[PDB]
Amino acid sequence: TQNLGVKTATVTRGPLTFAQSFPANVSYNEYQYAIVQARAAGFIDKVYPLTVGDKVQKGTPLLDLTIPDWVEAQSEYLLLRETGGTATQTEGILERLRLAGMPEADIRRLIATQKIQTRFTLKAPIDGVITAFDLRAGMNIAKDNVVAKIQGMDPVWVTAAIPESIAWLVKDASQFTLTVPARPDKTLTIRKWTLLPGVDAATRTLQLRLEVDNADEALKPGMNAWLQLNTASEPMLLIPSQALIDTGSEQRVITVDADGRFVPKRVAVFQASQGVTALRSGLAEGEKVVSSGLFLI
Amino acid sequence: TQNLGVKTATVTRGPLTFAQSFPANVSYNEYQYAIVQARAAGFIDKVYPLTVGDKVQKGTPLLDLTIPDWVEAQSEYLLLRETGGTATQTEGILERLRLAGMPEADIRRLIATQKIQTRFTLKAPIDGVITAFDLRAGMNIAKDNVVAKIQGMDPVWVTAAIPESIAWLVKDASQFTLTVPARPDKTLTIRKWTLLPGVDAATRTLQLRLEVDNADEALKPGMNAWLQLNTASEPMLLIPSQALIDTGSEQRVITVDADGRFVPKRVAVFQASQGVTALRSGLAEGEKVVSSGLFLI
């Protein structure tokens, strides 16, 4: 006939990629917590417009506390400077003050204006969301006490339930595709990942935590999430799923001899996945085949 | 480190074994059957006490049928024998009656007793169990119609569903273990397995046709059966679970220097299952570790 009209593809060896989807729940990191504690004893004042679940940044305000004890050993210092004292013990008294817990900032103000450092406003360390707070103005804070607990949310924590038999198969965070029913437009980025070895006696499941990048504050613990995972398979003979044809107990395809000529070739399919099929027996690597051809008998 | 009463085990490279469990349907094998089809057309007599689900032995009864068209061809043949009929033409018609559909030893009973053969009871081939066999007393058959068929129990067919992702991991049927709720048999030997490359779009599960040796007769299609599978994993550094210790970020064990002396080595467990654990990074093959006992500090 000589009326050819074809597009081709070439046999290769490689794995099959297996799609599989799992349920994940957004979560807050137990490393991204802060505990605002108080070095030394004192008494509260002010308190600020923080209710118990707001959002603070690098803790700008939080509460002012007066502290006795301190002022006494800052004053006895003011005389020593006023009385030609050893520039070693004046700074020595400051070192024992830094030990007590004095902010180097108010120390720097004591050296300048000399006006004694009365009470100071303590500020929260991280950005985040207040988890537990309370307190009222005019309490005595013991030693180091918890004045506040904060929760960061710059990283987030989706955790899928994985079969243990498939865990050793993971490897690279590029098989992870993360997607959420809610707020869908955002493209989640899996900054890290890890496999908390604790196996779910409930069936045989591993926990697969993924640190997701939360910088649009558009992720809330409890949201529904879908982990579109991917896997491989010991390398097999890959032909473009399209190029294969079956009629029943018989399954084969077209071979190309670089001569533009065709020929029947019986193959034995292993299985198919995502776009291609892999043969148990049949052809051989390099061999050519046709994925988009068209002709009659 | 000064106590005797300690046991020990050594780090050894190897794979983990993940046992699983799937639901298997029992089934009759499509190949171990026997169709009792009738050549030519005709009409039924007798039909015997078979009911459509009974036990037979080389189908020694079944049903009788008679044929109008056949008795005619033989008759004229008989007149050749009586008159002057060429030796080769009398056969010419016996050759046209064999292919017509006549049983041989029915034709050899024609030539033997010169009697028009008209009624042939037809037996069923195999020892088995009747599937399909309703029709009775005086009906019309044709071409090669099916008057009956039979099933065998020498092989039985449990077919568990497997996920495509774990499929390529199968191999060797020694990682198979079949079990039954009803009639927990001594043991049920797996004589041959086979993975049908058909992906059930319903789910992503491949069929795992499993041929069960049933020389006995204790299996029946429709029953429920459990198939427990034994997967593995690319090798890792294996230690006895007992031999590992950690309750926080500390996460490791004890090394033995053959001197009977010890040392803390910080490891990182990949995952575990069964009764052993696979290290990510920590120890080195051959390195010894303690699996029991203790000592003071």
The alpha-carbon gap from A270 to the nearest alpha carbon of chain B, in Å, equals 6
Tally of CB atoms within 10 A around A137:
12
**C-alpha A55 chain-centroid distance:** 20
User: Pick from B199, B206, B231: which is nearest to A165 by CB?
Assistant: B231
A80 φ/ψ angles, rounded to the nearest 5 degrees: -60, -35
Q: Which three-class secondary structure string do you get for chain A?
A: CCCCCCCEEECEEECCCEEEEEEEECCCCCCCEEEEECCCCEEEECCCCCCCCCEECCCCCEEEEECCCHHHHHHHHHHHHHCCCCCCCHHHHHHHHHHHCCCHHHHHHHHHCCCCCCEEEEECCCCEEECCCCCCCCCEECCCCEEEEEECCCEEEEEEEEEHHHHHHCCCCCCCEEECCCCCCCCCCECCCEEEEEEECCCCEEEEEEEEECCCCCCCCCCEEEEEEEECCCCEEEEEHHHCEECCCCEEEECECCCCCCCEEECEEEEEEECEEEEEECCCCCCEEECCCCCCC
Picking from A54, A64, A194, the residue whose alpha carbon sits closest to that of residue A138 is A64
Q: What are the C-alpha distances in Å from B31 to residues A10, A94, B187?
A: 37, 95, 24
**Residue A49 CB contacts under 8 Å (≥ 6 apart), including other chains:** none
B13, B237, B271, best to mutate vs chain A, most A CBs in 10 Å: B271
Residue B72 DSSP symbol: H
CB within 8 Å: A234 and B168:
yes
Q: Which residues of A touch B175 (CB under 8 A)?
A: none
Query: To what resolution in angstroms was this structure determined?
Result: 3.4
Residue B279 DSSP symbol: E
Residue of B nearest to A269 (CA): B197
CATH class of A67-117: special
**C-alpha A71 chain-centroid distance:** 45
**3-state secondary structure (DSSP) of residue B77:** helix
Q: Which residues, in sequence order, are bridge partners of residue A278?
A: A238, A271
* Phi-psi category of residue B286: left, alpha or beta, with phi > 0 → left and psi -120 to 50 → alpha: left
CB within 8 Å: B168 and A233:
yes
**Cβ atoms of residues A216 and A209 within 8 Å:** no
Domains B33-66+118-151 and B67-117 share a fold: no
Q: Which residues, in sequence order, are bridge partners of residue B269?
A: B279
A133 φ/ψ angles, rounded to the nearest 5 degrees: -160, -90
B169-205 CB burial, b ≥16 within 10 A, e <16: bbeeeebbbbebeeeeeeebebeebebebebeeeebb
User: Pick from B19, B199, B269: which is nearest to A272 by CB?
Assistant: B199
CB within 8 Å: A168 and B272:
no
How far is the C-alpha of B85 from the C-alpha of B115, rounded, in Å? 18
The alpha-carbon gap from A250 to the nearest alpha carbon of chain B, in Å, equals 13
**Residue B115 CB contacts under 8 Å (≥ 6 apart), including other chains:** B109
Residue B48 DSSP symbol: T
Q: How was this structure determined?
A: X-ray
How far is the C-alpha of B103 from the C-alpha of B53, rounded, in Å? 27
User: Pick from B168, B234, B273: which is nearest to A199 by CB?
Assistant: B273
Looking at domain A15-32+152-235, does it have CATH number 3.40.228.10? no
The alpha-carbon gap from B169 to the nearest alpha carbon of chain A, in Å, equals 8
How far is the C-alpha of B199 from the C-alpha of B206, rounded, in Å? 5
A16, A20, A22, A165, best to mutate vs chain B, most B CBs in 10 Å: A165
Q: Which residues of B touch A209 (CB under 8 A)?
A: none
CB within 8 Å: A273 and B20:
no
CB within 8 Å: A234 and B199:
no
Q: Which residues of B touch A169 (CB under 8 A)?
A: 165
**3-state secondary structure (DSSP) of residue B244:** coil
**3-state secondary structure (DSSP) of residue B74:** helix
User: Pick from A19, A197, A271: which is nearest to B206 by CB?
Assistant: A271
Provide the token pair at B157. Answer: 């067919």
How far is the C-alpha of A174 from the C-alpha of B52, rounded, in Å? 59
**Is residue A20 classed exposed, middle or buried when 0-12, 13-18 and 19+ CB atoms within 10 A define those classes?**
middle
CATH number of A33-66+118-151: 2.40.50.100
Looking at domain A1-14+236-297, does it have CATH number 2.30.30.100? no
**3-state secondary structure (DSSP) of residue B46:** coil
Any idea of the CA torsion for B132, B103, B64, B60, to the nearest 10 degrees? -70
Q: Which amino acid is at A62?
A: L
Residue of A nearest to B235 (CA): A168
Place of tokens 């399954």: A251
B164, B171, B252, best to mutate vs chain A, most A CBs in 10 Å: B164
Q: Using beta carbons and an 8 Å cutoff, which residues of B are at the interface with A?
A: 16, 18-20, 163-169, 195, 197, 199, 204, 206, 231, 233-234, 236, 269-273, 277-278
Q: Which residues, in sequence order, are bridge partners of residue A44?
A: A65
Provide the token pair at A264. Answer: 């029947």
Residue of A nearest to B279 (CA): A197
Residue of A nearest to B197 (CA): A271
Q: Which residues of B touch A271 (CB under 8 A)?
A: 164, 167-168, 195, 197, 199, 206
Q: What are the C-alpha distances in Å from B140 to residues A295, B134, B136, B137, B146?
A: 46, 14, 10, 10, 11
The full set of domain ranges for chain A reads 1-14+236-297, 15-32+152-235, 33-66+118-151, 67-117
